[PDB]
């Protein structure tokens, strides 16, 4: 009875942590996207 209640709580926490990360993914989307876009430019520079 104790384990079953503790598992259901961990499933609720997992969904909450996933939702939190998914909001932070969008906040740092612009930071990373810039990082990525810059890297590919640096690879073009190597070729010339």
CA atoms within 13 A of residue 23's CA, in its CB half-sphere? 5
Question: Which technique was the structure solved with, according to the deposited record?
Answer: cryo-EM
State whether the Cα torsion 40-42-46-48 is positive or negative.
Answer: positive
Torsion angle in degrees (nearest 10) through CA of 36, 40, 42, 47: 170
Token readout for 25 is 């993914």
Q: What is the residue whose two structure tokens read 């997992």?
A: 14
């Amino acid at each position: 009875k104790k384990t079953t209640i503790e598992i259901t709580e961990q499933q609720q926490k997992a969904k909450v942590t996933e939702a939190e990360i998914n909001i932070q993914r969008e906040h740092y989307r612009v930071v990373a996207a810039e990082g990525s876009m810059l890297y590919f430019l640096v690879i073009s520079l190597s070729v010339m």
